[PDB]
């Protein structure tokens, strides 16, 4: 396809985010690379404004599904790569159960050989003593299924899934994700049949890094269609 070929090898990745959660302003820069052939992502994020005001796990989904591995028989359902190199807009509302919500708007596209994800995040109605602003979430991550449906109305896709973050007391903090993606260019894109992405993520720390940061290793494969 017009974008499939752009992901046959290792692609450098850059992530830039500006956020405001209940008035707490912060920025994050991330770098790494992705190898869609194997659905693999390796990235390191740094809070460039000091200490991150929310827990790192809560931003993982916000921080390039074009790196998902789509089985050859499912290639016609790969909206993400089809929108490249012009890219796509990714918007979400993430509802943290019994707490506030994040609204995000991002643009994912190529700048030369680098795949860039530029994001604006706004969080409101959070409890200053809740699990988010109170930093009560464990630094870990679970495997999830990301459900995708076409949206011919806007020539894009609708995505939904639930992330369950582990709370330090053994409980769980649900983060309900509502997502929409639309192409940036006026070119054609692939509208998919219903399917999902199987995702797994591991979080770690750089032992020599004194800045507030997160190291992420992720594997994602499309499934649901035979």
Curated annotation (Swiss-Prot):
Changing residue 220 to R: In Azurite; shifts the excitation and emission spectra to shorter wavelengths and increases quantum yields compared to BFP. Changing residue 202 to V: In EBFP1.2; shifts the excitation and emission spectra to shorter wavelengths and increases quantum yields compared to BFP. Keywords: Chromophore, Luminescence, Photoprotein. Disulfide bonds: none annotated. GO terms for biological process: bioluminescence; generation of precursor metabolites and energy. Changing residue 149 to T: Increases fluorescence at warmer temperatures such as 37 degrees Celsius. Contains a chromophore consisting of modified amino acid residues. Maturation of the chromophore requires nothing other than molecular oxygen. It comes from the Eukaryota. The keyword Protein transport does not apply. Changing residue 143 to P: Increases fluorescence at warmer temperatures such as 37 degrees Celsius. Changing residue 172 to A: In mut2.1; shifts fluorescence lifetime from 3.03 to 2.50 ns. SUPFAM superfamilies: GFP-like. Changing residue 159 to A: In GFPB; leads to enhanced fluorescence at 37 degrees Celsius. Photocytes. Changing residue 194 to I: In mut2.1; shifts fluorescence lifetime from 3.03 to 2.50 ns. Changing residue 151 to V: In EBFP2.0; shifts the excitation and emission spectra to shorter wavelengths and increases quantum yields compared to BFP. Changing residue 199 to Y: Gives rise to yellow-emission variants. In EYFP; leads to yellow fluorescence, folds faster and more efficiently at 37 degrees Celsius and has superior solubility and brightness. Changing residue 218 to G: Suppresses the 399 nm excitation peak, leaving only the longer wavelength peak at 475 nm. Changing residue 65 to L: In RSGFP4; increases fluorescence and shifts the major exitation peak to 489-490 nm. Changing residue 194 to S: In EBFP1.2; shifts the excitation and emission spectra to shorter wavelengths and increases quantum yields compared to BFP. Changing residue 63 to L: In EGFP; increases fluorescence at warmer temperatures such as 37 degrees Celsius. In EBFP; gives rise to variants with blue fluorescence. It holds the Pfam family GFP. Monomer. Energy-transfer acceptor. Its role is to transduce the blue chemiluminescence of the protein aequorin into green fluorescent light by energy transfer. Fluoresces in vivo upon receiving energy from the Ca(2+)-activated photoprotein aequorin. Belongs to the GFP family. This is Green fluorescent protein. It comes from Aequorea victoria.
């Amino acid at each position: 396809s017009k974008g499939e070929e752009l992901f046959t090898g290792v692609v450098p990745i850059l992530v830039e985010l500006d956020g405001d959660v209940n008035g707490h302003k912060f920025s994050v820069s991330g770098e790494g690379e992705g190898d869609a052939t194997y659905g693999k992502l390796t990235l390191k994020f740094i809070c460039t404004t000091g200490k991150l005001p929310v827990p790192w796990p809560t931003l993982v989904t916000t921080f390039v599904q074009c790196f998902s591995r789509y089985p050859d028989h499912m290639k016609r359902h790969d909206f993400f790569k089809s929108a490249m190199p012009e890219g796509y807009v990714q918007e979400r509302t993430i509802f943290f159960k019994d707490d506030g919500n994040y609204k995000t708007r991002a643009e994912v596209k190529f700048e030369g050989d680098t795949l860039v994800n530029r994001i604006e995040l706004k969080g409101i109605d959070f409890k200053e003593d809740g699990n988010i602003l109170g930093h009560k979430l464990e630094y870990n991550y679970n495997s999830h299924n990301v459900y995708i449906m076409a949206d011919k109305q806007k020539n894009g896709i609708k995505v939904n899934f639930k992330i369950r973050h582990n709370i330090e007391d053994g409980s769980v903090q649900l983060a309900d994700h509502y997502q929409q993606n639309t192409p940036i260019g006026d070119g054609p894109v692939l509208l998919p049949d219903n399917h999902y992405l199987s995702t797994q993520s591991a979080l770690s720390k750089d032992p020599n890094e004194k800045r507030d940061h997160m190291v992420l290793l992720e594997f994602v494969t499309a499934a649901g269609i035979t």
